[PDB]
Amino acid sequence: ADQLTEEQIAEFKEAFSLFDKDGDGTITTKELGTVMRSLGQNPTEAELQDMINEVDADGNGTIDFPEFLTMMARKMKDTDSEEEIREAFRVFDKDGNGYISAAELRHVMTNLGEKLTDEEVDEMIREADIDGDGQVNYEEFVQMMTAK
């Protein structure tokens, strides 16, 4: 579950360096909390440390690029099981509609700082909404989540 393609790795190089403010090759909670700060979120030291330590396999206490590759590849596809897919569904449809609603996804985006327009989220939902209910159910989202 650590597979990335070369172009994929190249993008992660970029992303990694965007968070790695010191440009040293390891991301600290300082850097995370700062990118979060500019994003409009102030998580705790504990949240960020745990977040790191989860991917921190070498035990140095920071997120190295190999570990990031591991982390992302699991988030983008599988940790092992369908956890990642349902956790993503869970963060989109909190209200339990059984389907992800665009209006709610727009709301979570505002909360995530991604800041997407209604038309943007509408299009995202529309493609994921396979049966055409205007809302995407889990079975529809499972195909979409891995389509990155």
Partner: peptide, 27 residues
């Protein structure tokens, strides 16, 4: 990491990666 080539694919990638946790690092 922009979204211009296909836009949807990149955004659906990036914004959804970020959604994975409250203090989610997509990096």
């Amino acid at each position: 990491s922009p979204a211009n080539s296909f836009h949807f694919k990149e955004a659906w990638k990036h914004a959804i990666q970020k959604a994975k946790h409250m203090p989610d690092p997509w990096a």
